[PDB]
Amino acid sequence: HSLETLYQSADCSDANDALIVLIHLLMLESGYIPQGTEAKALSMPEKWKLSGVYKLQYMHPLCEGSSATLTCVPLGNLIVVNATLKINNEIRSVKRLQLLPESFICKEKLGENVANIYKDLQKLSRLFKDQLVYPLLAFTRQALNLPDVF
8 A cells, every 4th residue: 555655646757757666665665764754655755756867865773873865867768776875974875776667667557556557576676675775774784883784
């Protein structure tokens, strides 16, 4: 219900929008808390979609004293997810991930149920988590001089 709820809040216009919503939900399910919204399970953060690019900002209970930013850039048929960490007003690049929306989105069905729209979800989920979320958390923990949580 959260995916479908967040999806309708998003007012997706294209395949890229639909992919970003899914990415955001995966961040939420890993424990990240989004800035720009007071109801993380109901609506997308304000300005999540700004002039061709997407920006998602989070804090995490396992990473006190830091904030994580996903900057998502449409490059071609690709979407590039950039993960960036801010600690003590210092910005550090963490990781990038290249995603191909066509592999996971049925763009012809964006107005329908999310079950009709997303394909190979478990594929995209383990890709995003294994190559972005977990490396980001581990990188952050290190930067914060904390023991790893995995």
